[PDB]
Amino acid sequence: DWGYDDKNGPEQWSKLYPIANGNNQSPVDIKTSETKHDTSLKPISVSYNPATAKEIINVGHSFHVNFEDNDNRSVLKGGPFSDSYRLFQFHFHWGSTNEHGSEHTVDGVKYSAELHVAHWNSAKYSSLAEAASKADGLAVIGVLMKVGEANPKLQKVLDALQAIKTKGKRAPFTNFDPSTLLPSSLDFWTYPGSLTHPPLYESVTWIICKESISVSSEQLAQFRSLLSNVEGDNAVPMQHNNRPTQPLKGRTVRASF
Ligand SMILES: NS(=O)(=O)c1cccc(NC(=O)NCCNCc2ccccc2)c1
Numbered sequence: 733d734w735g736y737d738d739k740n741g742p743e744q745w746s747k748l749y750p751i752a753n754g755n756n757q758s759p760v761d762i763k764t765s766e767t768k769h770d771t772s773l774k775p776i777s778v779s780y781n782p783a784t785a786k787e788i789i790n791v792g793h794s795f796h797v798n799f800e801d802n803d804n805r806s807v808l809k810g811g812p813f814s815d816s817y818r819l820f821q822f823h824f825h826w827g828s829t830n831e832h833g834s835e836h837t838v839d840g841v842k843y844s845a846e847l848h849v850a851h852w853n854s855a856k857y858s859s860l861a862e863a864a865s866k867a868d869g870l871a872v873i874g875v876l877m878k879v880g881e882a883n884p885k886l887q888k889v890l891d892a893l894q895a896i897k898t899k900g901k902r903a904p905f906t907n908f909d910p911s912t913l914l915p916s917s918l919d920f921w922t923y924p925g926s927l928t929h930p931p932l933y934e935s936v937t938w939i940i941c942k943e944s945i946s947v948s949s950e951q952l953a954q955f956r957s958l959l960s961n962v963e964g965d966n967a968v969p970m971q972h973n974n975r976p977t978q979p980l981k982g983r984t985v986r987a988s989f
């Protein structure tokens with residue numbers, strides 16, 4: 733049972749998941765002096781249908797907002813991709829204090845949290861379960877979240893957490909378009925990488941937005957007030973769930989800008 737504390741956390745994951753020491757691990761530090769501008773990168777195109785929003789779930793280490801993924805009502809196109817990728821989930825990472833919490837860093841700078849919008853390749857594969865281990869199977873948009881003014885676009889998500897306070901609790905989460913959470917500019921970096929927690933499959937093409945979005949200290953506190961224990965047990969707040977950055981191992985981070 734992997735986790736984020738010192739006994740089961742990122743620096744121990746390799747004992748159970750050897751790919752943690754792989755060549756395409758995520759997240760990474762994006763050194764902007766070493767990025768390579770790619771004129772062939774197309775703009776990112778997201779077209780999400782709010783009716784595909786399904787459920788919010790406390791998964792112990794985090795919470796997930798899941799989407800109906802039976803058809804192409806909600807898709808990501810463009811960027812480095814030739815195929816269409818079908819939305820299936822968004823979630824966040826945060827840290828114990830505001831000084832850290834993002835997974836990716838930019839020129840060594842740690843942000844307070846990070847939003848992940850995850851999709852799977854429905855052009856080549858028939859299900860998330862099939863796509864999840866394929867090198868071209870997953871596409872995840874990462875948005876760095878900078879502490880500052882309260883972000884009103886997070887409201888529906890934050891209001892839902894009171895119904896999923898403890899591990900395993902699930903509740904309907906409907907009529908929501910998560911493209912409303914993205915920054916106004918979709919200038920981006922991209923690199924081949926991995927899921928940032930077990931099973932750490934090197935199946936993710938990362939799209940990291942250049943522009944951050946805001947989040948307030950109190951909104952971050954709502955994340956950390958989620959409980960990792962099951963109802964009835966001693967309360968264990970979800971203090972943090974971000975993985976440290978990993979070596980590029982010769983990968984190249986491309987810039988759309
Ligand atoms: N932080 S992330 O790298 O952007 C990222 C992106 C997408 C999914 C996850 N994790 C989870 O969805 N966990 C809950 C269910 N686990 C089964 C599973 C295995 C492989 C792929 C999807 C689902 C993490």
Ligand SMILES: [Zn+2]
Nearest residue numbers: 823825848928
């Ligand atoms: Zn994530």
